[PDB]
Design a protein around this motif. Sequence first.
Motif, PDB file in Angstrom:
ATOM      1  N   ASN A 197       6.904   2.314 -17.571  1.00 56.50           N
ATOM      2  CA  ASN A 197       6.457   1.059 -16.983  1.00 56.50           C
ATOM      3  C   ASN A 197       6.029   1.213 -15.533  1.00 56.50           C
ATOM      4  O   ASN A 197       5.301   0.358 -15.023  1.00 56.50           O
ATOM      5  CB  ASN A 197       7.563   0.006 -17.073  1.00 56.50           C
ATOM      6  N   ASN A 206       3.833   3.019 -14.032  1.00 57.67           N
ATOM      7  CA  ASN A 206       2.412   3.099 -13.732  1.00 57.67           C
ATOM      8  C   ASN A 206       1.827   1.725 -13.994  1.00 57.67           C
ATOM      9  O   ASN A 206       0.862   1.313 -13.345  1.00 57.67           O
ATOM     10  CB  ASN A 206       1.746   4.204 -14.568  1.00 57.67           C
ATOM     11  N   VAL A 207       2.456   0.978 -14.895  1.00 57.97           N
ATOM     12  CA  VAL A 207       1.909  -0.302 -15.319  1.00 57.97           C
ATOM     13  C   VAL A 207       2.528  -1.393 -14.460  1.00 57.97           C
ATOM     14  O   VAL A 207       1.957  -2.478 -14.296  1.00 57.97           O
ATOM     15  CB  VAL A 207       2.153  -0.548 -16.818  1.00 57.97           C
ATOM     16  N   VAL A 208       3.701  -1.100 -13.896  1.00 60.62           N
ATOM     17  CA  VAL A 208       4.276  -1.990 -12.897  1.00 60.62           C
ATOM     18  C   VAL A 208       3.338  -2.118 -11.708  1.00 60.62           C
ATOM     19  O   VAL A 208       3.143  -3.212 -11.164  1.00 60.62           O
ATOM     20  CB  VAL A 208       5.664  -1.482 -12.472  1.00 60.62           C
ATOM     21  N   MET A 220       0.090  -2.108 -11.307  1.00 61.02           N
ATOM     22  CA  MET A 220      -0.984  -3.089 -11.418  1.00 61.02           C
ATOM     23  C   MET A 220      -0.446  -4.486 -11.167  1.00 61.02           C
ATOM     24  O   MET A 220      -1.008  -5.257 -10.383  1.00 61.02           O
ATOM     25  CB  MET A 220      -1.642  -2.996 -12.794  1.00 61.02           C
ATOM     26  N   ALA A 221       0.683  -4.808 -11.803  1.00 55.09           N
ATOM     27  CA  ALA A 221       1.379  -6.055 -11.537  1.00 55.09           C
ATOM     28  C   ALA A 221       1.825  -6.163 -10.093  1.00 55.09           C
ATOM     29  O   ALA A 221       1.663  -7.227  -9.490  1.00 55.09           O
ATOM     30  CB  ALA A 221       2.588  -6.188 -12.463  1.00 55.09           C
ATOM     31  N   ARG A 253       0.807  -1.210   0.000  1.00 56.12           N
ATOM     32  CA  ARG A 253       0.000   0.000   0.000  1.00 56.12           C
ATOM     33  C   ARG A 253       0.844   1.265   0.000  1.00 56.12           C
ATOM     34  O   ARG A 253       0.294   2.358  -0.159  1.00 56.12           O
ATOM     35  CB  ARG A 253      -0.954   0.003   1.197  1.00 56.12           C
ATOM     36  N   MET A 290       4.487 -15.918 -15.010  1.00 58.00           N
ATOM     37  CA  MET A 290       4.773 -14.823 -15.930  1.00 58.00           C
ATOM     38  C   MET A 290       5.846 -13.893 -15.384  1.00 58.00           C
ATOM     39  O   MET A 290       6.827 -13.596 -16.073  1.00 58.00           O
ATOM     40  CB  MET A 290       3.496 -14.036 -16.216  1.00 58.00           C
ATOM     41  N   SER A 348       0.306  -4.615  -7.739  1.00 54.87           N
ATOM     42  CA  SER A 348      -0.940  -4.698  -6.983  1.00 54.87           C
ATOM     43  C   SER A 348      -1.364  -6.155  -6.840  1.00 54.87           C
ATOM     44  O   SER A 348      -1.646  -6.627  -5.736  1.00 54.87           O
ATOM     45  CB  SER A 348      -2.032  -3.868  -7.665  1.00 54.87           C
ATOM     46  N   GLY A 349      -1.385  -6.881  -7.951  1.00 56.21           N
ATOM     47  CA  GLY A 349      -1.734  -8.286  -7.921  1.00 56.21           C
ATOM     48  C   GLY A 349      -0.583  -9.177  -7.506  1.00 56.21           C
ATOM     49  O   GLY A 349       0.426  -9.261  -8.210  1.00 56.21           O
ATOM     50  N   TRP A 370       0.193 -15.357 -12.417  1.00 52.68           N
ATOM     51  CA  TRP A 370       1.060 -14.232 -12.083  1.00 52.68           C
ATOM     52  C   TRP A 370       2.459 -14.706 -11.712  1.00 52.68           C
ATOM     53  O   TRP A 370       3.451 -14.038 -12.024  1.00 52.68           O
ATOM     54  CB  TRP A 370       0.462 -13.405 -10.949  1.00 52.68           C
TER      55      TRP A 370
END
Lengths: 94, 94
Positions: free
Chosen positions: B63, B65-67, B69-70, B48, B85, B72-73, B82
Amino acid sequence: EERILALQLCGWIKKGTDVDVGPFLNSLVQEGEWERAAAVALFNLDIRRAIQILNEGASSELNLNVVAMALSGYTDEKNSLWREMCSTLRLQLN
Amino acid sequence: EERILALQLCGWIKKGTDVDVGPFLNSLVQEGEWERAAAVALFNLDIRRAIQILNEGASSELNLNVVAMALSGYTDEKNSLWREMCSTLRLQLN
């Protein structure tokens, strides 16, 4: 039948009863449109093919592979962190 | 006492107890060393706060901002999608 005609006027499946969107995906693939191919492949309920398309695009031409790893973590839990984050951060992409 | 003397020397903590590694954290966002800011925050279980730093370390001027999400999960399952990958796609980042 009234639904198999609509999908054929939109150019997702070629003519005939053999409706499995393979030729459209590869035509998109060497047309030079990776992201749209990923979208269509995912819409046809397959993640792994989208991963193949995205990493292959990452081979040519640095943002694609991280996005593939991001789409890798799909979750269906009612309180998934992926759900909330990827919901709030979607508008930031281009 | 031995291991809260080692942290004192390295820079993690300050004079006293100051259990939060915050006062050494926020001394780096101002400096502009963002890729550190997540890493030092992550080792103390702060999924968090990794989002909170990477997202706020991106508005100014990838990357990252897109890191998120990854990042996050995260499932820690046996053979999840996950897990497989992110293991291979770690090597392509800069």
